[PDB]
Amino acid sequence: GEDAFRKLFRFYRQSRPGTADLEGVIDFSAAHAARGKGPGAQKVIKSQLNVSSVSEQNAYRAGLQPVSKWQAYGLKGYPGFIFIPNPFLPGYQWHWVKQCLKLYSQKPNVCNLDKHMSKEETQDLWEQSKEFLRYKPRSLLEKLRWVTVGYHYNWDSKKYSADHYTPFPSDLGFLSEQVAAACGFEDFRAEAGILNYYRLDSTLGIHVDRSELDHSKPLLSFSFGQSAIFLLGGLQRDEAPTAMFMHSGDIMIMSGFSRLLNHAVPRVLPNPEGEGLPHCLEAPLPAVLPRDSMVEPCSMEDWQVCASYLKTARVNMTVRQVLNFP
Numbered sequence: 001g002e003d004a005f006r007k008l009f010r011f012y013r014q015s016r017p018g019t020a021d022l023e024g025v026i027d028f029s030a031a032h033a034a035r036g037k038g039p040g041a042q043k044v045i046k047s048q049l050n051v052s053s054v055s056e057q058n059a060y061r062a063g064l065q066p067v068s069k070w071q072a073y074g075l076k077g078y079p080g081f082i083f084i085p086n087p088f089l090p091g092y093q094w095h096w097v098k099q100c101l102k103l104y105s106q107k108p109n110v111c112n113l114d115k116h117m118s119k120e121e122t123q124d125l126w127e128q129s130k131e132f133l134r135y136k137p138r139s140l141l142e143k144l145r146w147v148t149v150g151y152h153y154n155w156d157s158k159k160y161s162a163d164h165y166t167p168f169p170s171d172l173g174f175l176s177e178q179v180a181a182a183c184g185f186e187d188f189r190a191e192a193g194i195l196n197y198y199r200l201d202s203t204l205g206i207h208v209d210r211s212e213l214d215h216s217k218p219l220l221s222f223s224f225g226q227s228a229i230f231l232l233g234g235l236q237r238d239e240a241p242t243a244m245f246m247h248s249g250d251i252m253i254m255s256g257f258s259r260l261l262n263h264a265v266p267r268v269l270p271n272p273e274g275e276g277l278p279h280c281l282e283a284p285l286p287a288v289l290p291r292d293s294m295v296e297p298c299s300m301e302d303w304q305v306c307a308s309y310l311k312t313a314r315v316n317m318t319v320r321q322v323l324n325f326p
């Protein structure tokens with residue numbers, strides 16, 4: 001580009017994995033004393049979690065490790081910003097990817113394959129995808145770009161849909177509220193969410209989520225599949241951002257003034273052998289889940305679709321409290 005955020009976004013978009021092009025990116029999943037990079041790594045600080053605020057039972061029920069096993073970080077100069085590397089129990093990411101791909105995209109919610117009205121939804125998305133695999137044209141699941149849950153934009157009023165509120169998925173609600181509680185938002189309520197589905201060449205340009213405090217509540221950002229490069233900038237659009245990786249299962253929480261910062265995803269990184277899954281996903285969802293659990297079993301035919309999809313995709317979930325938002 002021409003200004004410093006656009007320069008870095010283009011840099012990272014055109015960057016070569018596996019070379020020193022990325023030695024400037026923070027990896028919160030690396031074991032260091034905030035070194036090795038220059039300016040980025042030096043900003044990394046521990047952030048304290050409200051460990052007593054999420055019981056063991058409730059973490060487990062959510063598919064999470066016990067909050068006391070979590071690590072969490074901020075960045076000097078970015079108030080309200082918390083980064084938590086994958087706190088999910090092994091296998092449990094598969095549940096949330098399944099829900100995003102198969103259930104949440106189901107028609108009561110709104111997706112990009114129409115604006116807000118309905119197009120003729122011929123041939124259920126999931127069961128086509130199931131039989132695109134069995135038999136050797138662009139999949140209906142491969143075309144999905146975003147999905148709104150809870151609150152849905154109308155695009156003419158430029159505000160949320162009048163008479164179309166859909167109930168917020170209570171498993172994703174429980175998970176979000178456990179994380180938000182441990183970040184010290186024990187009253188948080190999940191009410192509006194967006195699911196973003198990226199291919200390996202998909203990007204997200206420089207943007208802010210909202211422009212107003214006085215109604216701003218915390219926003220949580222989940223990630224699954226391939227890693228992305230995340231750029232976190234400032235209130236004005238040409239302040240140079242800080243680059244960081246989002247690996248499968250990482251969670252970012254934005255509150256306070258962080259909620260207003262310009263951010264971006266310039267790059268979804270391919271698996272280093274071009275097609276394949278991150279290591280944390282090499283664990284399957286247990287066969288026997290706890291009876292009191294908010295997660296449900298996953299079927300082989302469902303897993304196969306997810307496993308094939310994610311080889312070249314990143315799934316993003318953002319969840320926020322409402323009581324809006326370019």
Ligand SMILES: O=C(O)c1cnn(-c2ncc(OCc3cccc(OC(F)(F)F)c3)cn2)c1
Pocket residue numbers: 146147148152153194196204208209221263264265316318324325326
């Ligand atoms: O993948 C990541 O890491 C990432 C980081 N940010 N991000 C992101 N941020 C904002 C955002 O705005 C959604 C938005 C706003 C208003 C109305 C909307 O309704 C409609 F459905 F679009 F019509 C939607 C989407 N995605 C994703």
Ligand SMILES: [Mn+2]
Pocket residue numbers: 207208209263
């Ligand atoms: Mn955003």
